[PDB]
Each structure stands twice: as C-alpha cells, then as structure tokens.
Design a protein around this nucleic acid. Sequence first.
RNA 1: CGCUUCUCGGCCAAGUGUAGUAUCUGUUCUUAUCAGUUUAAUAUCUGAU
RNA 2: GAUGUCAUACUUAUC
Lengths: 870, 44, 100, 70, 69, 90
Amino acid sequence: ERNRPLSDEELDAMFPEGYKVLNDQPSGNLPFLKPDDIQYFDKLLVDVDESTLSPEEQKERKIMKLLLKIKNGTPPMRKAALRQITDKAREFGAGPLFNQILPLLMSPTLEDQERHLLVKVIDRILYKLDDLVRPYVHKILVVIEPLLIDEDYYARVEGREIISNLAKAAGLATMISTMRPDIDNMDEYVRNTTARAFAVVASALGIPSLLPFLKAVCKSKKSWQARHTGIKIVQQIAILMGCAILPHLRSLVEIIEHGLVDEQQKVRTISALAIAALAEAATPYGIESFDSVLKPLWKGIRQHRGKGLAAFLKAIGYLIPLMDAEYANYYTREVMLILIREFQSPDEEMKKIVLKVVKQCCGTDGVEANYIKTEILPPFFKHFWQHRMALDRRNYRQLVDTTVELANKVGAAEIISRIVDDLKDEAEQYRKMVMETIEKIMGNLGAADIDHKLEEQLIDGILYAFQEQTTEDSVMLNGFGTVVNALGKRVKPYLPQICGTVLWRLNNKSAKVRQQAADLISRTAVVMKTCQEEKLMGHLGVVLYEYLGEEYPEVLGSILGALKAIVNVIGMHKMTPPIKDLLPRLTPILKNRHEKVQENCIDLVGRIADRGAEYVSAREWMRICFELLELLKAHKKAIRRATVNTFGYIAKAIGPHDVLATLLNNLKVQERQNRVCTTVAIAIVAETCSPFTVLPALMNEYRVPELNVQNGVLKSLSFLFEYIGEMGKDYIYAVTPLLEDALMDRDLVHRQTASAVVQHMSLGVYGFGCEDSLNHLLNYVWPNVFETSPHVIQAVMGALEGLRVAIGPCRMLQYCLQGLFHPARKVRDVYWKIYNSIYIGSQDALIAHYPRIYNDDKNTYIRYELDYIL
Amino acid sequence: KDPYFMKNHLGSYECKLCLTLHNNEGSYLAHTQGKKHQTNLARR
Amino acid sequence: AKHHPDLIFCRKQAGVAIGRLCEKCDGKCVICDSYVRPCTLVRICDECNYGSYQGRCVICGGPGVSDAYYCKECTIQEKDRDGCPKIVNLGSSKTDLFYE
Amino acid sequence: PYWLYKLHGLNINYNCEICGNYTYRGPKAFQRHFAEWRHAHGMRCLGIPNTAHFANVTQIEDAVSLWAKL
Amino acid sequence: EHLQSKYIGTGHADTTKWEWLVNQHRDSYCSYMGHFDLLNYFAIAENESKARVRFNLMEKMLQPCGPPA
Amino acid sequence: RLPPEVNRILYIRNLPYKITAEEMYDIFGKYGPIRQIRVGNTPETRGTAYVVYEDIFDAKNACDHLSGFNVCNRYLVVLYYNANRAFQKM
RNA sequence: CGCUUCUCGGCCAAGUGUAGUAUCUGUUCUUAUCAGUUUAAUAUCUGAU
RNA sequence: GAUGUCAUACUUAUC
C-alpha cells in the first residue's frame, strides 16, 4: 500500500501552492476489509437492526467488530477497541471470545503485526478470564504451539509469556490433562511443540509439580514416541531453566538414566541430549549427580559411531568440566583420539559438536600445550578453517570461541601466525571472522607474544581488511582499535603508513568510506598520545576541521566523533584547531535533524562549555542556549540528556540569569518531551550554581495563569529537590506555601506534582529536624489518597513512602489509624495497602507505635509485658 | 457578549451557568450551542 | 521500571553477582530510574546471571557496559534490601515498535 | 429531574420518631436536619441536651437511655 | 495476594481484628526477643533469668491471643 | 519493517536559493530513483523543497541520510511529509 | 595577473509508536409492591408479581 | 450522577 505507484494528480494535490516543478464497507466508518478476510467479519456487512432479533451472539458480533477495528484499523481505534475488550472481558465471556479469536489466528493469509496484536489481545484477555479458560486450554495451546518455534525472538518470548500465563491461570491439573493426548501424536513437530509447552508449564509452575507426571511419562513402556517426547521435554526444561533445576538435578538424572539403553537410537540420542543439557546447567558441578551416567555413555562412544556417538561425545564434553581434576584428565586422555578421528566427518552437526567439545576439552590442567600444538591444532586448522563455516552464524561463533579457547590454552602467537594469512582473502565473512578472532586474542591474551616478524604482517592484514570492507559492520574498526590498544608503543613505525591511508580514504566517490575512515581515526586517537605523537594529531585535527562540510550526515557525525576524540585525547586549549574558531563553526552544525550528528554536536558543545568556556565573548553562548531548546523532542534519549548538562554548564559559565528566562519562556509549548526536558535543565542549572538565585523566579512561574507552566515549574522544583537532597533544608520554608497551594488545586496533575515534590523534600531532608513542614504537607497529601487515577495514586503512595521515613512510622500509623476497620471497602483497601507499605518500610518501629487494644471475652489482646513497670 | 464565559487560573475557559470546563478556545464557542446550555439559558 | 506499570522484577535471593547496565541505561537507577546520587550497587540473583546472562543489562537486557547502582532515595527507603531488581518479562514495551 | 433525585438519594422515605414521627426525603437531608433548630426543639422537650452523642438518635426510648447512661 | 504470602503480617482489606492482634503480638514478642534492653527489663521485672524469659516468650508465640473466632 | 511516519515524499527546509535543479537532483538521486522534485518559488516558501521518490525504502534511506545535510543556507534538514503540516498556512 | 585609492557586507514544517487520565459535544430510566445477589448506605441486576 | 460514539487537553527524564 505504501509502495504503490501514484499518478500525477495525486502527487499534485498533496503539494501546496508556490512550488515549481523541476455494499463493500461495513456499516459506516469501519476500516478496510481484506478480500481474504471476508469470512470472520461476514456478519458485519449487513446491518444489525437489533429489535426482536438479538441473541447472546449479538454481543459476539460487537466483539468481532472490535477485533476487526483493532486488527486493521487506526492505532487510536485499536487502543479504544483494546480498552473496550479488556474492561468487558468478564461480561463478554471467554467462550465466544475464544470462538472468534481461534479461527482468526489460524488463517493462512495472516501477517506478523496481526498475529502480534492477536497475541497481545490474548495476553490482555487472560488476566480477567482467570479460572475460566480451562475448556479452552487446548484451543489456545494449538495456536500458541508454533509461536515458540518461530524465527523471531520477540514472537517466541510472547508465546512463552502466553504459555506461562495460561499455566498460571489454568493451574497444574488442567494442563496435564490437556497435554496428555498430545504426547503420542503422529506429528513430530506437534510433539516437539507439546514438549516445549510442557517444559514452559513446568518452568512456570515449578519442577516438583510436574516431576511425578514426567516420571510416569518417561518410565512408561508402550512406544518410543512418548519416551522421546518426555526426554525432549526434560531437555527443554533443562535448557530453559539455567540454575533452577540444580535442587531437582538428582530427580531428573534418575529419570534420564533409564534411557539410552533401549533399542531405539532416537531415544538414546534424546537421552544423551538431555544429559548434556543437565550437565550444561551443572557445568562445574554435575558429576555429583552423574556417576550412574558416565558408565553407559562412554561405552556408547566406544561401541558405536554416528549421531549417537556425537551426542555422547557432546555429553562427555559437557560433563568433563563438572568433575574432579583426575577424572577430567582421565576423560580427556581417552577422548582426544576420538576427537581427532572425527575431524574428517562430512556431517555438519558432528563437526559442530566436535568444535563445541574441543573448547571444553582444553580449558584446565591435564592437556599439555605441546601435544595440543602438535596433534590437535594442525587438524583443527586444516579441517575446520574453511569457507563454508563462516556462512552460518552458529558455525562461525562456535569456531571463534574454540579458536579463542585454543589461543588462551596453547598461545596467542601460535594462533596469530596461522590466522594472519586469512586476513587478506577474497571473502568478507571469513575475513570478518578472522578479524574478530584476532580482536578476541588481543583482548584476552594480548600482543606481548607477537614478535616483530608478525606485527607488521598483522597490521597489513588489518589495513587490507579495513580498506576492502563492503558492509557497514563495526567489527573491523573495533578489531583495529583493539590491535592499536594491544600494540601500545609498538605501532610507532606505523602512523605514517596508517594515517596516510586514512586521508587518502577521506577523498573518495563513496560516502561510507569517509565515515569508515573517520571512525578508524576516532578509534585510533587514544594510541597517538601515548606514543609521543602530537604533530600528527595536530595535523589530523586541522584536516578534520575542514572535513565538516561532507554532504553525508553519517560521515559528518563520524567526523564530529573523531574531533571529539581528538579534543579528549589532547588538551582543550592546546589544539591547532582552537576553540575560538571551532565553537562558532559548530553553531550551524547543531541545527541538524539527524540523531547521531546532533548528539555528537551536543556532546562537543557540552565539552566546550565545561572545559573551554573562557574562549567565547559571552554572547554566542546566549545564542546557543536558544538553539538548545530545539535540541530536545528527539526520539533518541541521549541528546536530551546532554542538552540539560550543556545548559547547566552555560548557566555556570555566563551566570544563572539569562538561561533561566529562556528555560521559563520555553515552558509553555504544550508538547510532550519538551517541558520536562526544560524543567530538568532548570533543575540542573539550579543544582550547578546556587539554587537561591533560582528560588524567586521559580516562584514567579507559578504566578502565571497557565496549567502547563505551573506543572513545569512544579516538576522543576521536584527535580531540583531530588538533585539537591540534603541541601533542601534551607529551601523548604520557601516551597512550603507553594506546595500547600498546589495541593488544593482542582487539577490532579498539579496535585501529583506537589506530592512528588513533597516526596523529594521528605527524602532529601530526612534526619534534619524538618518534621514540622512535612506534617503540614501530609495533612494535604492525605485527602489525595482517594483518587482514581493510577498516576496520582502512585504519586500519593510515593509521597507516603517518603514521608514515613522522614516524619516517622508513628505519624504514618496514626494517619492510617481508624481506616483499616472502615465500612467502605474502597477506603479500607487503600488503608490496608498503606498499612502494608508502612509495615514493609519499618516493621520493628510499629511495636512502640501500636495503639492500646482492650481484651475481649474469649481472647486477650492487652500487652502485659510492656504495661509493667519496675 | 456572553456573561457566563470566564477565565480560570490555569488558562482554561469556564461556563458559570452550566458550570463546565473547556481546555481550548474552540471548545467554549462550541459549548454555547447544545442541549445543556439552551436548557440553562431557558431556566435562568 | 516506574514508566511501564506492566514490568515485574525477579525478587529472588540476591547473591554475589553484581548487576550491569548498558550504554543506553547507564547511570539510571533500577527502581526509581534516577541519574542523581548513586548510593549502593545492585546485586543480581543466581538465576538471572548464569551462562550467557552474565554481564547483561537489568532493565533493557542488552550487553552491559557500566556497573548498576541504586539511587540515594532507594537506600534510605530500604528499597535495596528487597529481592533481585532484574526485569524478566517484557510486556507492551520495545516489542510492538520492532514489528512496526 | 428523576436522575438528580435518584443519584442524590432523594424521594426516599425516612422516619424521625423524635420530631413527631416526621418524614425526610434524604439521608444527607436527615443528617443535616439532625443538627438543626427543629431537632433541637424536639429534643429540648424531653430534656436531653444538644450534644454530639445524640446525633444519630431517632427513637425517644433510646435517647432517654443514652441520656440516663451519661 | 502474593504480598501476604511472601511477607507475613501485612494484611488485606478482609483482615479481622484477631489476626491483626496476633500479628502485632508476634511482632512485639520478636522485638522483645531481639532487643537486649526489653529482655533485660523483663528479666529485672520478674525473678527469672534471660533464658527462662526467652523460653516463656518463645512458647507464647503459638496463639498469643488464644483460639481464633 | 518501517514506521508509519515514513513516506515517499520528504520535505527539506533552509535550502539555498541559488541551488540549481542539477545539484538538487544529484543530491536526491544518491539513495535511489527520484520521481519528482518541487522547489519553492515564493517569498513565503523560499528555502523549502519537496522530493518524492519512486521507492518507499529509497525514500526512507534518503530521509535517514539527508537530515541536516551540508548545505550553503544551513543544515539540510529532511523531514517526512505530513498532510496536516504542509497545509498549515491555509 | 600584481600594486595603490574609493564604496559595500560578514566574524571576534520538530515527526511517529505504547500505557494511563480530565472535560464538553450526540443520548436513555415518574413501574406500584414482594424475595434474592450486591453496595458503608444508595444505585444496578435477577426473578416473581 | 451513570452509560456508550466523537473531539480536545494532561501525566510517567517511556521509545
């Protein structure tokens, strides 16, 4: 729809004047129905006309219309439909809701966003339909089963959350009754999905809640499919819960030990995979509950060969670090020949299992470095360092981890001399994997073992890998920076060779090459100050000062980052591009609509305001404080956090008298993410300089007849109190009649802001003797507890939790008194929640503050221990 | 010249005859015509 | 966090694993989500930091960069003596924007 | 209006045995007329002083026991 | 719900006076057994030692107010 | 995967008035085929332009790599086209 | 193209996504009793009438 | 005072 071609008339109608060219709609304003979606919403094209023809299915028609409006309608319409379906889920019932939701999600012409919205509606309709979806457990499970095996991680996480919510709502017996015929099914994918759902239900409802059911399913001898499904469910429960199966490791190992002795090789492979998953969890301590599993497994590595032998070798490599030193030495002394014999295996899964077991076979004592370099490392370099291994990510990352383990075990130089030859290849993925392995070897071990005969070859290979890059990945730049950090002072005969290739990369037809050269200059900027190279940095800064005119904003942001790195690595007042001819040069650069370029410009402006504030005539900073108000309202959450620090630095430099009026004039914009970002900047300016100079002016902005300006001033006062803390004892009497008048307003947002300011004043002035103003503010914050808005209720709860620590738990128990036994339950629940919060805040303090209760006829409640006196 | 529309202390509009609140200036001019304002003018 | 009301913490037994924070959430608190006056570091549980989950962000979940710490308003209000402040489930936050 | 009389609790019969078994068309109206001149004149004939203990007192036999108990 | 199951003694909106009184008595007994000053005052008030007072306070934790109602 | 804020048309503000059609076309066609380009010839519309591309992904790439671009007049901010914001003068 | 003189000028359309909330605007119940769920009490619902 | 449609406005250093 968004990529459809448009005619000249539609293009001309969407442009204003002054520019030179160089029935099929259901019942009104319902959204557009697809031609393949005319089956679930077929009852909406005809009119309702509800008069002597309206059964209980007429509410299901409205629920289907709401689902059609939430599926393909407007996002405000989708939010209104979700608010109408969430608040009325109990009245509509789970029956027709499930009967309308289940064929809609099972359509073969669905999409990712519609399935995500259906899963969100099923998750939001599961909290009000608790203990009511037990007949609809299997119908929801048959739709949630392929969601866990999907490609996207977010859809799998949503399916796991929906399965956990269904296990928490339907209990344990209903899921065990529903998942019982789904174990012996003919479909293997449905059996694997049922095993994954059973593992998710066991993770969400506890391991001993489903342990005897899994033990009865695993020990039953009727077919190999039920035992294979039980072993797969045990392996999935071991792989899902990392450290949660450690108290229940023996009860799972005793059930897993019954397998791998049957006539079926698939059940033995599943039992070996479950043992490897259980040993994976108990990677350092699995031997304790594994002595009955080491005897049939190792003979399986001796008596047979194939996929089961590879699974047994993976289980042995997972159980070998979890044993003693002599046991691991005896295991590695008899499995190295089986690993060397499996180096020529044509199978990819056996090669991946061998590469995973080779990382764990050499990680401790017992394996010598000479034998590993003689008989283990040449076949690993000849059989695994190929071009097909770099294609798959799971075959590249495991190979890189095995190479890092071999470099940490044997040595970094012996791996570097064998991996430096692949840095100048013709493949991008193999060169990127070799650069990542070299960066990991330089970060873990270092560059001390590399002599002078290999460092120049490695630098040439890194330069050939960086100069011949076709993708936008940052692996090569990070590897070059890691090599330059590991080299240190050994790169002194390399700076005319590298930087001369950098400036030659600065003039090219492409746009990503200049950005890559600027990123490489920014990553190698810290290696120039430590090698006594100051003329080259001064030449590069003067070169990059004229490189701010690149039309690509992605290259301009990298050039700004390189200039910031050069200004950080060198002195602020000792730069050949000085601050007198750079801070006016960055003033039109700050008006860029990009995210990273404006973030780098704001960081450079904050650094120039913090370290070089004496380089301006105090007039350009006032003109940049008005451009700092347009630096907010950006969806990046980084430039808005640096603009407040830059405004605070400008207020500290030029005085807190001109930026405060600019911050108060920008408080009335009526836009989100622009008045809170100015209130935080005003609070940072009041916290950097003296806050008393910002005390009457913040008292003046509440005098203007505006709700947004008063809310921004109250938010700025609350943020200034939270930033001050213990310095708020002198500014409490000036803010007490403001907070006493803001709490009596009709607007609930001003009352919530006053409650937040009272919470900040109670949390900042605790232990200073300011319990008189806090008790006055609590008398106004106490009628605000009966609000219906969750934000105002959360602000009142935070104010109560801040005032209970300041004024004492006795005053909070006195204010919460005579409300726990209240007749009205709406006040009684809030009083019980406040009493529970006061008990969780200070439980020992409520003993002396407890009221006196008289004794009853049958029971006694008078404390005779504290009533006695000596 | 409407003697019922007033300005509050928060930058809003207030109808004193029907005692109603309005956020923008376009909601006070649309609240004069309606079932409640006509009934309040006929009763007073 | 305090912005999303549907976020739940782990609340398990706090061990010796120190929490980590990413570059996008560096300096922010775990509960109050404030960037002023850090007072006490965050201790993660054993289930939330095991294997591939070591050195990860507590709030977002990405790769950690800096050390996690609680604000000064949480140490005085006895908010750091509770369970593990690790966000486990992600509901209605950073999930619909990836699909849109 | 029927809605303003149903939401505010109006048109609901309440009996006050102290003021000659008078009628009241509201609980809040009865609570306001309890602390009034008419209820004080009705309670002054029995000899009970106008205090806060006899605010929710309706029957004369209960008000006499409440006055004799104090 | 979960707050009453995790931390005992919190209470809810349907909490009676007997359970609240038993929780307050258990908290007072725990504060007497924890603090050395209250135990010293209770041992100075009677003729028993600190161990006998601690055994009397520990045995009174099971239904300190009596049977429920 | 794309946000609904992106569109085939992108507006540019603070553009140089001395820029020709060839330089604007060379700046626009770096990310893909440009369908149309309209430059303002009014005193109330000077310094702004509208570039409509043939592909939505190329238009999104141009919006990502054209914002605050180097321009004589000023940063070449390239925002997305809005129907309510373009007709704000009416 | 270089030097000298006069005049002019510069510097020191801010978008989209998510959660929650307060107001108008277009509307509905003079059903007399009885029993029940519920509500602090009203209100509301179910029946019978 | 409540309901269900529409619009406006506000809050959570949300992205």
